[PDB]
Write a protein that binds this ligand. Structure first.
Ligand SMILES: *C/C=C(C)/C=C/C=C(C)/C=C/C1=C(C)CCCC1(C)C
Ligand SMILES: *C/C=C(C)/C=C/C=C(C)/C=C/C1=C(C)CCCC1(C)C
Ligand SMILES: *C/C=C(C)/C=C/C=C(C)/C=C/C1=C(C)CCCC1(C)C
Ligand SMILES: CCCCCCC
Ligand SMILES: CCCCCCC
Ligand SMILES: CCCCCCC
Lengths: 209, 209, 209
């Protein structure tokens, strides 16, 4: 129906598969610590799965009026990111044994980041979308700024790299400037999401930290 | 007005009453541990009270189009369950001193469970409602799978038993197949809710664990 | 456009400024404890900033039908208060080293307080708005009831005093009786909000507790 359906069906399948893989691997885990990393890392694609599926079916899609057009906005991504991004930071934070003080900074900057992104997404005055983008981007840079040694270091690098593309994709995509069509937009986010969650989780869960 | 009002007024009264009872009983509690069980167990009907009331008044009711009809859906139940179900699992988890790792699995599976139930409830393609039902049901079975010795054992049994009816009621009720009318549906959930919260709480709070 | 814009622009600027001040001051903080108070206290105006801005721009404003009129309701305040009020109680609670049991009572009573306030705000039957007001007010009195020695004592007093005006303002404002216009209403909340967050935070962060 919608040309981007194939990328949504595919992300659904890969988050679906990735969840099951992590579930099965986390069986045989007595370790308090590993228990924690496993619950976190399996929850991330499990949530992604549900929101890829809601997008695949018409549910996590709405039409937002701006620039003289009704524009198709996938709101379900923010509902995913709202929980999946703090869990990933929490994976990193527990890894290096961050202070409560620092987790709350990361987690709270993270909610502001995707909170303001959602507002950007649904804002009906074109110009103001970019104000909300700018604010969310500044909350992202705070997180990067704030962001065993070896796998943390690797995981942080992957994070810094993949997370940074998201505002770039949103900015040039249908949420922002409309220069890259929803189609390739949805592919781009698909590859990003699977790498930041299943990829990130493979790295983390097969590692000894 | 609506034939099911009497069951909503009644659940409101019983959650209202149950909250006050637990409040009054929790006075004279110096114990850190008991403090924790009391705050949890009193919060559960206090939230239920507000959502029984929002349903009683027209607020937590919307009309969802599917199957060629506009169908009356009580969305306020999910807003209740979203917080009340993790608190009940938390009562059980603290009881047996579960790992952080395991609480996060329970709590996160619980949010997916009622998260997907809400989507099921509001989904406008009849067939897809049942996909969302199936996913939520599978998250429920995970929780049951994951789920002093004596009161835990009793409390777990009550939980396993009453929680399992909910998807059955939803499936045959107005959310699903429309074979049991909203009326008796609302009665059924009423009895279930009061038993899983006030009943569960009586058992737990009068016990010595 | 809207006469109350000047108070929204102003609250935006002061929450904006207050956030930056606290950020800059929290640099050079190695202390686990102070780390915690700083993350909490900086998050509070950072969130307020975003919701003052959403209100300034048309976003956090909706029209609710009651009393034969469509009434302008600023829903974005509840989205602010939902997170900012538990963080402030958490500042107080950590200050005096409250039990987990007591934090959960405070935090959960706090969510019910602003939860029911939101319902009040959007309720389309005039009379019922005041039922929801009454319930939220009773959850507030519970919190006050439940609510180093010196700065706690000072901070508690400020809290008791400023928080208590909010239901008074809502009751006489456009949410309730419509006796005080939105204009002065927005000014009143503006002064209250800046005092309860930036004022409260100055007191707390310059203090040695
Ligand atoms: C699994 C999903 C991941 C790791 C997604 C991360 C998303 C972000 C870092 C999003 C950032 C955004 C901005 C900085 C502004 C524009 C809107 C967003 C939400 C795309
Ligand atoms: C106090 C309320 C309780 C304990 C409610 C528990 C509710 C559930 C276990 C609901 C489960 C559902 C499914 C498994 C799928 C269909 C939708 C739900 C949300 C009714
Ligand atoms: C920074 C913001 C603060 C401290 C706001 C606090 C708000 C309240 C204590 C609000 C209380 C309300 C009622 C008790 C009933 C009417 C609705 C509210 C939400 C204004
Ligand atoms: C949106 C993620 C924050 C939820 C935390 C409430 C304690
Ligand atoms: C919906 C229950 C989860 C809220 C947790 C955020 C930390
Ligand atoms: C609304 C504040 C509560 C979020 C807590 C979920 C654990």
């Amino acid at each position: 129906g919608r040309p981007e359906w194939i990328w949504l069906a595919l992300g659904t399948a890969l988050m679906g598969l990735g969840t099951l893989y992590f579930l099965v691997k986390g069986m045989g885990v007595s370790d308090p610590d590993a228990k924690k990393f496993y619950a976190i890392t399996t929850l991330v694609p499990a949530i992604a799965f549900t929101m890829y599926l809601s997008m695949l079916l018409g549910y996590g899609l709405t039409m937002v009026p701006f620039g003289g057009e009704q524009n198709p906005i996938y709101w379900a991504r923010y509902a995913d990111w709202l929980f999946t991004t703090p869990l990933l930071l929490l994976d990193l934070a527990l890894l290096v044994d961050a202070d409560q003080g620092t987790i709350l900074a990361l987690v709270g900057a993270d909610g502001i980041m995707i909170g303001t992104g959602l507002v950007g997404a649904l804002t009906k005055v074109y110009s103001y979308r970019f104000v909300w983008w700018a604010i969310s981007t500044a909350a992202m840079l705070y997180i990067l700024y704030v962001l065993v040694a070896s796998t943390f270091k690797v995981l942080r690098n992957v994070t810094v790299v993949l997370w940074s593309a998201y505002p770039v994709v949103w900015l040039i995509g249908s949420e922002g400037a409309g220069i890259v069509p929803l189609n390739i937009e949805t592919l781009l986010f698909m590859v990003l999401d699977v790498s930041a969650k299943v990829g990130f989780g493979l790295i983390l869960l097969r590692s000894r930290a």
